Amino acid sequence: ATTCTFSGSNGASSASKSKTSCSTIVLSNVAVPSGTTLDLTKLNDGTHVIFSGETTFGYKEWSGPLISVSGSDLTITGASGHSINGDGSRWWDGEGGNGGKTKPKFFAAHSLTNSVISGLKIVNSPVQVFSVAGSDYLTLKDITIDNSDGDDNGGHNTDAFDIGTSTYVTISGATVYNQDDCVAVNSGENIYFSGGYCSGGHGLSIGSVGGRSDNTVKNVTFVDSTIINSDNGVRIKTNIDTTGSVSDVTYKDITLTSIAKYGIVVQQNYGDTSSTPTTGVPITDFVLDNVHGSVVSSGTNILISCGSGSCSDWTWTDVSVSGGKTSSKCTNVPSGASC
């Protein structure tokens, strides 16, 4: 059993070259050089990684990731008082991932099996924070993401959790202040989100689904969570002219507070809302249970833009969204639901 401590301005290099001799790696006030990844890929099974002090990154216009981890039976945690500081205002230019500077993604959680990431505190990511991909039985718990400075400083596309090609991922106790989706499930199965607080972004989203070889979303649950001061609350987006499926999606015991645009929005014409919704990505067995909240007077309570026949078997129990306009543009609403 070995414990390895890496720190300072050359910590990232040493960690990379010695990671496989370390049972435990502690990362203390590591300053990652510009244009380079903190490469924690391919750790030995059972390795424990502890973030300590303040982790920082040199400035460069590149696409990331800033941190990358992969392997099995890993524990990665944060020590008391630590933070991982992206100092994103260096890149923030109002354009996020769409244009302006090239901005690096923060945390590649790829090819993780049976691992836990707990207690990390991330501050001011340049753009998206967690990219979860190709991972199985991953728990992300008590993660704090504070991009609140981005609200008035050009923060854009600062998604907290982007999930794809993953199964059995559990997210609990997340606290997010950001400017895009709190969660986006692009594809994946058996996803559980609970005890979350999402402020400032675009809601808890399924989507966008379709147009990739990975286009199935199944068995996802959002429960006991608050979405506040966000553009949308509950959201399902499927890409127009694409095929896939979304099934067994549940939102339960959700509080929506001061939603700006849409309390609940389901769009089967995502990508081109001037066109009629298409029917290639059926949304079935969608359940809302005890979902309550308020939309500002200028927003819309509920928008359902379904394709003909491509939305069915919805159950909406104890749902109440008020404060906003009732939409008159809803299409092909299933029997259990309403705008």
Ligand X SMILES: *[C@H]1O[C@H](CO)[C@@H](O)[C@H](O)[C@@H]1O
Ligand Y SMILES: *[C@@H]1O[C@H](CO)[C@@H](O[C@@H]2O[C@H](CO)[C@@H](O[C@H]3O[C@H](CO)[C@@H](O)[C@H](O)[C@@H]3O)[C@H](O)[C@H]2NC(C)=O)[C@H](O)[C@H]1NC(C)=O
Active site residues: 180, 202
For residue 283, the minimal CB distance to ligand Y (Å) is 17
For 328, residues 6+ apart whose C-beta sits below 8 A from its C-beta are none
Identity of the residue, 93 or 289, whose beta carbon is nearer to ligand Y in the bound complex: 289
Is residue 130 a contact point for ligand X (CB under 6 A)?
no
Question: What residue 2 binds from ligand X, ligand Y, none (CB within 5 to 8 A, per partner kind)?
Answer: ligand X
Question: What residue 14 binds from ligand Y, ligand X, none (CB within 5 to 8 A, per partner kind)?
Answer: ligand X
Chain residues binding ligand Y by CB under 6 A are 168, 190, 192, 219
Pick the closest to residue 266 from 246, 299, 237 (CA basis). Answer: 237
Tokens 């359902």 belong to which residue?
Answer: 304
Identity of the residue, 11 or 126, whose beta carbon is nearer to ligand X in the bound complex: 11
Is residue 65 a contact point for ligand X (CB under 6 A)?
no
The Cα 156–Cα 171 span in angstroms is 23
Is residue 2 a contact point for ligand X (CB under 6 A)?
yes
For residue 51, the minimal CB distance to ligand X (Å) is 13
For residue 62, the minimal CB distance to ligand X (Å) is 8
Maximum CA pair distance of the chain?
Answer: 65
b or e along 7-29 (b: 16 or more beta carbons within 10 Å of the residue's beta carbon)? beeebbebbeeebeebeebbbbe
Identity of the residue, 223 or 330, whose beta carbon is nearer to ligand Y in the bound complex: 223
Identity of the residue, 22 or 227, whose beta carbon is nearer to ligand X in the bound complex: 22
Which element (helix H / strand E) includes 105? none
Beta bridge partners of 311: 283
Identity of the residue, 73 or 95, whose beta carbon is nearer to ligand Y in the bound complex: 73
For residue 236, the minimal CB distance to ligand Y (Å) is 17
The single-letter code of the amino acid at 76 is I
Question: What residue 331 binds from ligand Y, ligand X, none (CB within 5 to 8 A, per partner kind)?
Answer: none
For residue 84, the minimal CB distance to ligand Y (Å) is 26
Identity of the residue, 18 or 320, whose beta carbon is nearer to ligand X in the bound complex: 18
For residue 79, the minimal CB distance to ligand Y (Å) is 24
Question: How many residues bind to ligand X according to rule CB under 6 A?
Answer: 32
Question: What residue 4 binds from ligand Y, ligand X, none (CB within 5 to 8 A, per partner kind)?
Answer: ligand X
Measure Cα distances from 59 to 123, 151, 160, 278 in Å: 15, 21, 21, 43
Question: What residue 192 binds from ligand X, ligand Y, none (CB within 5 to 8 A, per partner kind)?
Answer: ligand Y
**Selected binder of ligand X within 53, 54, 56, 60 (CB under 6 A):** 60
Identity of the residue, 6 or 222, whose beta carbon is nearer to ligand Y in the bound complex: 222
For 42, residues 6+ apart whose C-beta sits below 8 A from its C-beta are 20, 70, 71
Site for ligand X in 40-59 (CB under 6 A): 44, 47-48, 58
For residue 207, the minimal CB distance to ligand X (Å) is 34
Site for ligand X in 12-41 (CB under 6 A): 13-14, 16-18, 20-24, 26, 28, 33-35, 39
CA-based torsion, 110, 115, 167, 163: positive or negative: negative
Measure Cα distances from 78 to 49, 130, 142, 285 in Å: 8, 16, 10, 38
The Cα 24–Cα 75 span in angstroms is 9
The answer to whether 324 and 293 have CB atoms below 8 angstroms apart is: no
Measure Cα distances from 43 to 17, 19, 47, 116, 255 in Å: 11, 7, 6, 14, 39
Which element (helix H / strand E) includes 44? none
- Residues near ligand X, by CB under 6 A: 1-11, 13-14, 16-18, 20-24, 26, 28, 33-35, 39, 44, 47-48, 58, 60
